[PDB]
Nucleic acid binder design. Structure first.
Ligand SMILES: CO[C@H]1[C@@H](O)[C@H](O)[C@H](OC[C@@]23C[C@@H]4[C@H](C)CC[C@H]4[C@@]4(C=O)C[C@@H]2C[C@H](C(C)C)[C@@]34C(=O)O)O[C@@H]1C
Ligand SMILES: Nc1nc2c(ncn2[C@@H]2O[C@H](COP(=O)(O)OP(=O)(O)CP(=O)(O)O)[C@@H](O)[C@H]2O)c(=O)[nH]1
Ligand SMILES: [Zn+2]
Lengths: 52, 840, 189, 94
RNA sequence: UUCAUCUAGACAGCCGGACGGUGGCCAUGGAAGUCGGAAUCCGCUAAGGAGUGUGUAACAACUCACCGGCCGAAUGAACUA
């Protein structure tokens, strides 16, 4: 365990970002095109699942 | 121990006797601190052999680092009598035996701590530094605290924080701070109103700590006392005002309460400059492999280290120095003789919980005074075995009288009052032997409050026992103990011959340990119960040998499917026999499901006179008054779920056909057509019959067909549905993490019943109907959804109703009649409607 | 804009004839029991704490029956709001500042000022007593009551309200998150 | 007494215990509607009723949890009817 | 292309409320602002949905819809090739 106010520092910057649906890159918490070119800027995103 | 064999002079000196129970988490540190406690004894392999682990006693303990059960400990400890009158007790002797028992963690096992906790005289729980309280040190300590008992916490493993965790002067004091405070707040969850004064205070010498690997401990006394030989007087003053205040010491010796120096700088720790600056200086100095600071620092504290023991750097220079400073023998056992009661003091509030009668008879003064001259009863719960097949010791404790070898005492049972002649036994005892760790020592007599092994009496008690010799007294309690009746496993011998070794194997395994339970199926099969999974692993693994003598095989158990019809038996069915001899019309009226709970219990027992049950049917069920017309006798086995009809035409029939019609439909009312076995709340209505002959052209093998397709057919014509049992379980846990219970019941086809409060907020159990067909690992996934602290209880109550249409192989019921038909052995469920519906 | 036309007429009908004008810039508020001070203030003065028309609140005084309407055109900032009465305003100001009901912050939002915590009694069962490891206060149970051993700070200047240590701060019942009804400008006629 | 989980009004302070009702949301519906309002709602669902059964509803306005203040019974009668999805009590607004 | 919004201060951005009725009706052991069944509501209003989404097992703690302040203007969607 650590202090949860500092957990709001680390988990925001590695954990609670967004993810693509067709090639599984990590995406910022508002995006609409998976910026890696291979899936072709697809409009299919979702939240990365919750902590534990 | 050097008390060999002076261990009888100390047992009559009853003020000099104490005994405890160290219960904690699993990979936690119990079975090595006890090895320092008996490293004081001259029974371990001295110099050095630290990892003694005297709970070994067996294999599958040393290879795992684990504990199942453990015997006691004898010892005697030497000290000064100035160092002992801090107890209130008027004790005279200098030597003290600590006849030590204990019991492990393991939430699976944790009915076993009750058998060694309703018998002991003090609770000494063990807590890690870096972990704090774990989840079941507190639950397993508070099952039970309602005894009363004296919970003295003894934390340990400060070395793991001390070298790995890089602990500083403040953070480890915050570790003891939040650990000790967060563990003693929970002690007064159900502490009593006056004698619940067992709030752990450190400065009163209670919270001793150290390492099992480095093998040492101390509370604040023995670094206030050998420190109090210098630098002032006295022990109670500088030990009392300690722990927060603090002093200054760069220029002055003022003892304030604040945090600010006169120019503004923060002061210090009161703790780690007084009392543990040598542990930072010691091990932080040693673990950099310096050679300049350790002899001079050895001169800084208590000349000298001995002999050869200088040069051995590398974990021996580490390993021997605190052992030179202090043992855990003049530390922890010093705390044990200071603040822990004798049985003559602690037993006075002990057996009003344990004595079933009112405070009336000679035991209500001879237990309270714990007379050594009085009657000779005791109490026995756990049954430790020895290295034979098993002629297992009765772990007993006498509460009254000096018990004697070669003695004749009455024996009683679990739930028994001595009025009747059944199950009280009058035998004599073989031998009265004592035990330390893995060894034994025979004795002759003992006063009250002393646990002894008891030889040979084990044949005549089941998992618990009292054995009295003043036959007006009562039984001693069973308390309705704790966790885990709980789970079921089908068990079966191979190769079809060692059934006697199995049945003697488990009827002796039942007397082996009281935590497990065993019983028989609906079919008389061999299922064994259990407390969880790894318990059945650890003992039902070695039901292989030492318990039975033949290897076995394990299978999940077969749920008792039942059969039901409910609605109207759609068509008036007909049956023509394979000989052209008769026709059968019928229109079955399945009775309500009130006879499901109204066919067994004492409201009706059939084959009475034929008017009294007419009063019960007309006055209680809703039938007519002309039911005395209706019925004669039914099936199966007397106790069947039917009582027969008369919709036959009342002209002549059924007094020459009954003797092979009521002797015909036992199948099917003991073994049925759709799934295979019997049915309840059923009622066929034979409208028409035919016997176109006399009693020489009918008979046995001609008339025992007659229901050959009849109540088979019109049984199976309406809907019918197969039927299941659904348990009445309850699950107890506090409301930190109840959130998994309702959800996991929802994912396992369960039913919430209620929710209950209590004066506090622990143990908020929930009543839940939970069906048997998915009730197998339910305790296990309940542990995965809670994480430990939720203790199921499970019992049978009733027979519910299933409705997923078994006659068509589509749904859940079609699946279980399908695969359970494949293990039944016969093939498909019959389509029919030309079979069983002969169109006449 | 024709639904913004009923922001004209609801501002027209109050700015015709009456006595006072009193604007209040209320960014931070707690609406619930301050419009129970529209229920104790039921029919006293309907507030108009409305739209971005700070330019056209002073432009649209083209009637010039009271030509002092041009006051807030160089006030294109602040959340203005009109109340009015023909009564002495000195007595209502005693009660419309006493709307200092407060709640916890936004689970970790801003903080007004550093708060010192003494050892004062509350008197409940031991509830969150085993849940003081985030802040780390020495606090002891005695007589079935919660008593504080030593004084440990909670907040510090520069840092704000949190969620670990300040969730339990209103188990001690102070009022950080209100920002009550604050005076901006008062004038008669 | 109530089928909806009812809020009550009683403080626990030194012999003060009498279950009185605050005239809350589902609490005027128990009194004004038919005496089958505490009864006949175990299997039933009944979103019906349009008979003008009262015109003097305002004899609980000093009890009905002061919200709109200045008018006798204007605002409450279009609150209920929707908040009171049993009936509507008026031909005023639906 | 079509339908819209505004220098009468639009859009994004941060500061702010995010209610009283009323922990709305049934349902639900319980379903309290956010969980199933229909409907679908006024006062305060600057605002409030039977609430956008987390949240306890039912609560309490969080995010907006609406419109307040920021500063000075052009933006928003659906589409079409
Ligand atoms: C240990 O305490 C209790 C509870 O654990 C529980 O009530 C358990 O239930 C076992 C069952 C008892 C039923 C009666 C004996 C007749 C039908 C039996 C069951 C059906 O197979 C219903 C429950 C569940 C078990 C299986 C086989 C389906 C039963 C069985 O033991 O066979 O019994 C023990 C004694
Ligand atoms: N570092 C360190 N490890 C210890 C200490 N005491 C025990 N261990 C570790 O624990 C294990 C030995 O088991 P031990 O902890 O003594 O007993 P236990 O955990 O109580 C066993 P049970 O709880 O089942 O009775 C080893 O892995 C050993 O390294 C200690 O003081 N320091
Ligand atoms: Zn991409």
């Amino acid at each position: 365990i650590i202090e949860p106010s500092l957990k709001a520092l680390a988990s925001k910057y590695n954990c609670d970002k967004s993810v693509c649906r067709k090639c599984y890159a990590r995406l910022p918490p508002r995006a609409t095109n998976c910026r890696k070119r291979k899936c072709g800027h697809t409009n299919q995103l979702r939240p990365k699942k919750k902590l534990k | 121990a050097f008390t060999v064999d002076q261990m009888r002079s100390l047992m009559d000196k009853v003020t000099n006797v104490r005994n405890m129970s160290v219960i904690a988490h699993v990979d936690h540190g119990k079975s090595t601190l006890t090895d320092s406690l008996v490293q004081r004894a001259g029974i371990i392999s001295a110099a050095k052999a630290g990892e003694a682990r005297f709970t070994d006693t067996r294999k599958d303990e040393q290879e795992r680092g684990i504990t199942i059960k453990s015997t006691a400990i004898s010892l005697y400890s030497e000290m000064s009598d100035e160092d002992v009158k801090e107890i209130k007790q008027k004790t005279d002797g200098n030597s003290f035996l600590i006849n030590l028992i204990d019991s492990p963690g393991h939430v699976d096992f944790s009915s076993e701590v009750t058998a060694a906790l309703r018998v002991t005289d003090g609770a000494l729980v063990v807590v890690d530094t870096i972990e704090g309280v774990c989840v079941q040190t507190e639950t397993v300590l508070r099952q039970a605290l309602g005894e009363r008992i004296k919970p003295v916490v003894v934390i340990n493993k400060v070395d793991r924080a001390l070298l790995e965790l890089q602990v500083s002067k403040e953070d480890l004091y915050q570790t003891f701070a939040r650990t000790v405070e967060s563990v003693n707040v929970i002690v007064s969850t159900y502490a009593d109103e006056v004698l619940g004064d067992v709030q752990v205070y450190p400065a009163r010498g209670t919270v001793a700590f150290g390492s099992g690997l480095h093998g040492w401990a101390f509370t604040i006394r023995q670094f206030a006392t050998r420190y109090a030989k210098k630098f002032g007087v006295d022990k109670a003053k500088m030990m009392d005002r300690l722990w927060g205040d603090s002093f200054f010491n760069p220029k002055t010796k003022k003892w304030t309460n604040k945090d600010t120096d006169a120019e503004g700088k923060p002061l210090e720790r009161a703790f780690n400059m007084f009392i543990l600056d040598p542990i930072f200086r010691l091990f932080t100095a040693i673990m950099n492999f310096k050679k300049d600071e350790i002899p001079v620092l050895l001169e800084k504290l208590e000349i000298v280290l001995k002999g050869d023991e200088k040069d051995l750097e590398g974990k021996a220079l580490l390993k021997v120095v605190m052992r030179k400073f202090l043992p855990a023998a003049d530390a922890l056992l010093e705390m044990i003789v200071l603040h822990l009661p004798s049985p003559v003091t602690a037993q006075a509030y002990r057996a009003e919980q344990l004595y079933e009668g009112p405070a009336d008879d000679a035991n209500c003064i001879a237990i309270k005074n714990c007379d050594p001259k009085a009657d000779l009863m005791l109490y026995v719960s756990k049954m430790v075995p020895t290295s034979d097949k098993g002629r297992f010791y009765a772990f007993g404790r006498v509460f009254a009288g000096t018990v004697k070898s070669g003695q004749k005492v009455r024996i009683q049972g679990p739930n028994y009052v001595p009025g009747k002649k059944d199950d009280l036994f009058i035998k004599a005892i073989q031998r009265v032997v004592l035990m330390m760790g893995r060894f034994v020592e025979p004795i002759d007599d003992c006063p009250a409050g002393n646990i002894i092994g008891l030889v040979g009496i084990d044949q005549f008690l089941l998992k618990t026992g009292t054995l009295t010799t003043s036959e007006t007294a009562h039984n001693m309690k069973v308390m309705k103990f704790s966790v885990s009746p709980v789970v079921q496993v089908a068990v079966e011998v191979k190769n079809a011959n060692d059934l006697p070794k199995l049945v003697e194997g488990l009827k002796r395994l039942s007397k082996s340990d009281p935590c497990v339970l065993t019983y028989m199926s609906e079919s008389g099969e061999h299922i064994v119960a259990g407390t969880g999974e790894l318990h059945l692993e650890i003992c039902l693994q070695d039901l292989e040998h030492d318990h039975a003598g033949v290897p076995l095989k394990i299978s999940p158990p077969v749920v008792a499917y039942r059969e039901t019809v409910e609605s109207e038996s759609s068509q008036t069915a007909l049956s023509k026999s394979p000989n052209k001899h008769n026709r059968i019309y019928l229109k079955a009226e399945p009775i309500d499901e009130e006879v499901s709970l109204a066919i067994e219990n004492g409201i009706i027992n059939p084959r009475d006179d034929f008017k009294a049950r007419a009063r019960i049917m007309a006055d209680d069920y809703g039938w007519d008054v002309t039911d005395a017309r209706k019925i004669w006798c039914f099936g199966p086995d007397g106790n069947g779920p039917n009582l027969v009809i008369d919709q036959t035409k009342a002209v002549q029939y059924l007094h020459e056909i009954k003797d092979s019609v009521v002797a015909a439909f036992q199948w099917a009312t003991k073994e049925g057509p759709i799934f295979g076995e019997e049915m309840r709340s059923v009622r066929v209505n034979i409208l028409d019959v035919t016997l176109h002959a006399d009693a020489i052209h009918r008979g046995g093998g001609q008339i025992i067909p007659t229901m050959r397709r009849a109540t088979y057919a019109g049984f199976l014509l309406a809907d019918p549905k197969i039927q299941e049992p659904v348990f009445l379980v309850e699950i107890q846990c506090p409301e930190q993490a109840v959130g998994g219970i309702y959800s996991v019941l929802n994912k396992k086809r369960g039913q919430v019943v209620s929710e209950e409060q209590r004066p506090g907020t622990p143990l908020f159990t929930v009543k839940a109907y939970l069906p048997v067909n998915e009730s197998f690992g339910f305790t296990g996934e309940l542990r995965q959804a809670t994480g430990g602290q939720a203790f199921p209880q499970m019992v049978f109550d009733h027979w519910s109703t299933l409705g997923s249409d078994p006659l068509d192989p589509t749904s859940k019921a079609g699946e279980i009649v399908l695969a359970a038909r494949k293990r039944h052995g016969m093939k498909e469920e019959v389509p029919g409607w030309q079979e069983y519906y002969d169109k006449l | 804009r024709e639904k913004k036309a009923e922001y004209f007429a609801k501002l027209r009908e109050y700015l015709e004839e009456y006595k006072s004008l009193f604007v209040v810039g209320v960014d931070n508020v707690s609406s619930q029991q301050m419009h129970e001070v529209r229920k104790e203030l039921r029919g006293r003065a309907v507030v108009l704490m409305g739209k971005n028309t700070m330019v056209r609140r002073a432009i649209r005084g083209f009637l010039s029956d009271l030509p002092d309407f041009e006051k807030l055109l160089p006030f294109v900032k602040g959340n203005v709001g009109f109340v009015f009465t023909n009564e002495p305003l000195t007595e209502i100001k005693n009660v419309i500042v006493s709307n200092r009901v407060a709640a916890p912050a936004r689970a970790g939002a801003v903080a007004p000022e550093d708060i010192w915590v003494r050892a004062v009694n509350t008197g409940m069962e031991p509830g969150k007593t085993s849940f003081f490891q985030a802040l780390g206060v020495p606090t002891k149970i005695a007589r079935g009551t919660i008593e504080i051993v030593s004084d440990v700070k909670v907040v510090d200047a520069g840092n704000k309200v949190g969620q670990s240590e300040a969730s339990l701060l209103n188990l001690l019942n102070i009022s950080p998150f209100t920002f009550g009804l604050t005076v901006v400008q008062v004038y008669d006629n | 007494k109530g089928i909806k989980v009812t809020v009550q009004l009683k403080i626990q302070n030194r012999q003060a215990a009498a279950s009185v009702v605050p005239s809350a949301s589902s609490l005027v519906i128990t009194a004004l509607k038919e005496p089958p309002r505490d009864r006949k709602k175990d299997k039933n669902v009944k979103h019906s009723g349009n008979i003008q059964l009262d015109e003097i509803i305002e004899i609980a306005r000093q009890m009905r949890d002061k919200s709109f203040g200045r008018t006798l019974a204007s605002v409450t009668k279009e609150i209920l009817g929707t908040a009171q999805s049993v009936g509507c009590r008026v031909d005023f607004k639906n």
